[PDB]
Amino acid sequence: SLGPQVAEGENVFGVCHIFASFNDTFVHVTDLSGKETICRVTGGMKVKADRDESSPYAAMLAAQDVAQRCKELGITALHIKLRATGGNRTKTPGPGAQSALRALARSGMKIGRIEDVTPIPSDSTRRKGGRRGRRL
Amino acid sequence: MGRVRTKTVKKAARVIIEKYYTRLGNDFHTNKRVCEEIAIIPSKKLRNKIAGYVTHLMKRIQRGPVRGISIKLQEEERERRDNYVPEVSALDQEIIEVDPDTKEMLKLLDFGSLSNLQVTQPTVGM
Amino acid sequence: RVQPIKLARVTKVLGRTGSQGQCTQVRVEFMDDTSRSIIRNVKGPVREGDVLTLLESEREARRL
Amino acid sequence: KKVVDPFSKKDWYDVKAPAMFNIRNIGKTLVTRTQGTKIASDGLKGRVFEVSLADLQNDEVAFRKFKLITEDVQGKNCLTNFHGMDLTRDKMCSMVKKWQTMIEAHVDVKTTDGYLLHLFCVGFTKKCNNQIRKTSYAQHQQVRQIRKKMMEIMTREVQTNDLKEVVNKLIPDSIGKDIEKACQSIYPLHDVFVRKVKMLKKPKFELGKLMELHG
Amino acid sequence: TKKRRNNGRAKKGRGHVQPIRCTNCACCVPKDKAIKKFVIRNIVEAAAVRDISEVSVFDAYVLPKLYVKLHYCVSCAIHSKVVRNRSREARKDRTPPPRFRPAGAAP
RNA sequence: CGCAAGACGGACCAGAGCGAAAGCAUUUGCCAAGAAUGUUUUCAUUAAUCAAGAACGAAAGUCGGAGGUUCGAAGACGAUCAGAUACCGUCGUAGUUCCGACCAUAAACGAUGCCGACUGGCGAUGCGGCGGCGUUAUUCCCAUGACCCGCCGGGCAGCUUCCGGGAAACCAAAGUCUUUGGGUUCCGGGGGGAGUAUGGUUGCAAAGCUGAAACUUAAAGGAAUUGACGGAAGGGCACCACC
RNA sequence: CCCCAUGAACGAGGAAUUCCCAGUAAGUGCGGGUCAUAAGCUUGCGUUGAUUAAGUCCCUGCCCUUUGUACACACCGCCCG
């Protein structure tokens, strides 16, 4: 609980940070420095089946469990950094990344700016598993 | 749908209408009588099916010329319409406005004419 | 995180999906507020003017 | 075994921006209650927050970001200093279009106060309207001379003047325009920005300048 | 019997070019060969912006984009109907097209 | 948030460039080199193409170091299957990278020898030169510069064409071939046996070059045409199909 | 065929799978064919009479283009040690 201050106007600010890959979805607010956390919870924990780790509905549930303690500790508002697996990995967003954002905005926290932060590399380190491609 | 008129029928309709327009009508009941007079049709169901489609045509024709049908009366009507011509439109109003070069087109064509200059700027492809 | 129940009225019947061909596309006037209008998928036989009871009230599908 | 939920222990500070910016009250951040076994100011002091220049100015500065690093602490107040400018991702990605030449030059330079900076610029050839080639590349000759011009300016424009004037400079984007003037004689160019600035070496301390800039 | 006069995809004046990795199989195909499709999309999406516009401070703001340039090897781009067999005749058309620019009221 | 290592130069990046080919995208400097163009410079046949000989030659592999980040030929694992030594997951090897030597091969494909002339339309584009009382960008006019339009070379190509070629697919070269003759070089004579045996040669090795026969057999093969059929794409249609 | 007696399994059917859109499914009797005798059959007929898609191409089957094919006794076909 608690609150940086009474502020019948402006809102105490943190960082939202969502990593959407396929097979899961992390939501995550931290202090705008980053060094200090605040309430995490993934799209995994709120369903069982592995196959359903990453589904938007789970993602919703997670952004809901997160926004709770967010507005329960002190953050009134949050600026978001959405992400993909990145690296040489896919470079496209995972499915419950949108769902998480809709869930927290809908929840009734506050939104501020957006950038994508997936790590794109001035390319190399050879991508995994070999030349002939995953065959399948 | 399930009732799509076949050519043997549709043909007869185009047919009669071409040679029968001023005789035929708006109404199923009468053409049906007319098909007895102006055509020899073997079964009554066919003759009915014919009368009926040709009426659907007459209903349509009498609301706008239809894609492939011609009758003497419709030819006469188009003929008269295809006369129109006003005060007339060019004028073009005192003085042609030229794009020059088109000015130099007359200038070096040995030709007097009315005038105006507004022709500059290049001029991209795509 | 959530609960409510939403009344929505059919504006326009879109066509049919499901490979089996058993789900009917629908457009819904939002009943409590007309200044809303969304696409939802149906189990039953639906015709214009009758009413859906939306759980989710965002979402807004497409194929499947 | 149940224990020590941590927010119920944490303390709040109000992040303060340098003077050249406009409004200056960045937001708030939480640290643990200082215990002798600890310096909440310790876990507080080299923190860096990245804020959008638009929030910082108020605007057209949608793209552009400034990195603000906490340089000291005074009771619920923490005074930050310029640490960098980058662009984001969307903006940068949006400039980079096919059929045009992408030109980059960067230079590393020491300011009047010591700071060592690596400072990048960027530009793209422009088709000019009555062109009817579809593309609009530049020649190799061109880019080599253009880059020299960009580099000469960036060193010229940072050598003279301290971290603050670079800042005061990068806001109205005066470098951009200057490049545009020195380069149109050589080849078109659409876009053009100093797109990033990287702090390489910091001078020693001095609260004096920091306060001059804050306070 | 040779099918495409272009063989694979456009080389002619080279004999070599570095290869890229398919964004699906993680395969491997020369960059001259390989279907490429740009992909620009809003951070938020369809429905969100309304809660995203209401929940935010800032007076408008006005949405970033994610930009990603995809590469597919032949089998993936076929598989997923990025591209589709075209008759002996249609194959010759390099061009591109559709009728409106599908951005909200398309298929 | 910083830092270390090794790797690699994304987006920009193209029927676009250069290089004999293999191949070649960070900055900047040095070093020599290569084509095109311009050129009322220089020589006076210097020249075309080639047994023998020789230079280069992706990858793997091999010799010894550096190095191993990344990924990973082998192996061991988890699944899947009737079987699975596989695909699929995981751990992970030599190896990938780099230096000095080997090795001489890739559907090293444009599957198309090289050189010269001649025969056909249009518009692109890298580049050079040339021309414009065309545009825009500047100062007091400029010298600038980028463009538009045209002309000419030589690039890689494209497009459309009952010239003409070809069995056709196709091809402005695969044209100028029975009306068979511009120069030169190489390889093939049904298919298998076979790039095999054997001798020579080169190689540290792995292997490379040259290269038979006995016997076997009546088609091997090419191209186009059409169905049949598809766990290829748009397809449909029916409660002998589903819902 | 009847009359009595003896009075079984079966207390809802796994893997599978047929057929069906309106007098239709299903219950229900009758008549004709076979026939000397013999109906659990077939073959119609009226009677009583719903549930349920109202469509689509997913599976299956067959024909529509385009496409690939070493197939053409045509995939129930013809490839390596």
Curated annotation (Swiss-Prot), chain A:
Single biological process term from Gene Ontology: translation
Chief location bin: cytoplasm
Region Disordered: start-end pairs: 116-136
Pfam entry (one): Ribosomal_S11
PANTHER family: 40S RIBOSOMAL PROTEIN S14/30S RIBOSOMAL PROTEIN S11
HAMAP family named in the record: Ribosomal_uS11
Protein name: Small ribosomal subunit protein uS11
Curated annotation (Swiss-Prot), chain B:
Record-linked Pfam families: Ribosomal_S17e
SS bond list: none
Phosphoserine PTM sites in chain numbering: 113
Family, as annotated: Belongs to the eukaryotic ribosomal protein eS17 family.
One Gene Ontology term, aspect cellular component: ribonucleoprotein complex
Function per UniProt: Component of the small ribosomal subunit. The ribosome is a large ribonucleoprotein complex responsible for the synthesis of proteins in the cell. Part of the small subunit (SSU) processome, first precursor of the small eukaryotic ribosomal subunit. During the assembly of the SSU processome in the nucleolus, many ribosome biogenesis factors, an RNA chaperone and ribosomal proteins associate with the nascent pre-rRNA and work in concert to generate RNA folding, modifications, rearrangements and cleavage as well as targeted degradation of pre-ribosomal RNA by the RNA exosome.
Cross-link (Glycyl lysine isopeptide (Lys-Gly) (interchain with G-Cter in SUMO1)) at residue(s): 103
Gene3D superfamilies, alphabetized: Ribosomal protein S17e-like (1.10.60.20)
GO biological process, one term: translation
Alphabetized PROSITE patterns for the sequence: RIBOSOMAL_S17E (PS00712)
Assembly notes: Component of the small ribosomal subunit. Part of the small subunit (SSU) processome, composed of more than 70 proteins and the RNA chaperone small nucleolar RNA (snoRNA) U3.
Keyword RNA-binding attributed: no
A molecular function GO annotation: structural constituent of ribosome
Record protein name field: Small ribosomal subunit protein eS17
Record PTM text: Ubiquitinated at Lys-103 by RNF14 and RNF25 in response to ribosome collisions (ribosome stalling).
Keyword vocabulary terms for this entry: Cytoplasm, Isopeptide bond, Nucleus, Phosphoprotein, Ribonucleoprotein, Ribosomal protein, Ubl conjugation
Protein localization: Cytoplasm; Nucleus, Nucleolus
Positions of modified residues (N6-succinyllysine): 19
GN (gene name): RPS17
Swiss-Prot record, chain C:
A Pfam family per the record: Ribosomal_S28e
Record-listed Phosphoserine modification sites: 37
A GO biological process held by the record: ribosomal small subunit assembly
Annotated compartments: Cytoplasm, Cytosol; Cytoplasm; Rough endoplasmic reticulum; Nucleus, Nucleolus
Keywords (A to Z) from UniProt: Acetylation, Cytoplasm, Endoplasmic reticulum, Nucleus, Phosphoprotein, Ribonucleoprotein, Ribosomal protein
Record's keyword annotation contains Cytoplasm: yes
Highest taxon above the source species: Eukaryota
Disulfide cysteine pairs (residue numbers): none
Family annotation (PROSITE patterns): RIBOSOMAL_S28E (PS00961)
CDD domains for the chain: S1_S28E (cd04457)
Record GO terms (molecular function): structural constituent of ribosome
InterPro entries the record matches: NA-bd_OB-fold, Ribosomal_eS28, Ribosomal_eS28_CS
Recorded GO CC terms: cytosolic ribosome; cytosolic small ribosomal subunit; nucleolus; rough endoplasmic reticulum; small-subunit processome; synapse
Known role: Component of the small ribosomal subunit. The ribosome is a large ribonucleoprotein complex responsible for the synthesis of proteins in the cell. Part of the small subunit (SSU) processome, first precursor of the small eukaryotic ribosomal subunit. During the assembly of the SSU processome in the nucleolus, many ribosome biogenesis factors, an RNA chaperone and ribosomal proteins associate with the nascent pre-rRNA and work in concert to generate RNA folding, modifications, rearrangements and cleavage as well as targeted degradation of pre-ribosomal RNA by the RNA exosome.
Name of this chain's protein: Small ribosomal subunit protein eS28
UniProtKB/Swiss-Prot annotation, chain E:
Subunit structure: Component of the 40S small ribosomal subunit.
Positions with biased composition (Pro residues): 97-107
Biased composition (Basic and acidic residues): 86-96
GO biological process, one term: translation
Modification Phosphoserine occurs at: 53
Family of the protein in this entry: Belongs to the eukaryotic ribosomal protein eS26 family.
Keywords: Cytoplasm, Endoplasmic reticulum, Phosphoprotein, Ribonucleoprotein, Ribosomal protein, Zinc
Functional summary from the UniProt entry: Component of the small ribosomal subunit. The ribosome is a large ribonucleoprotein complex responsible for the synthesis of proteins in the cell.
Binding positions for Zn(2+) per the UniProt entry: 22, 25, 73, 76
Name the UniProt record assigns to this protein: Small ribosomal subunit protein eS26
Organism: Oryctolagus cuniculus
Region ranges (Disordered): 84-107
Major localization listed first in the record, in broad terms: cytoplasm
Presence of keyword Metal-binding: no
Single annotated GO MF: mRNA binding
Family matches, as InterPro entries: Ribosomal_eS26, Ribosomal_eS26_CS, Ribosomal_eS26_sf
Subcellular compartments: Cytoplasm, Cytosol; Cytoplasm; Rough endoplasmic reticulum
Gene Ontology CC terms, in alphabetical order: cytosolic ribosome; cytosolic small ribosomal subunit; rough endoplasmic reticulum
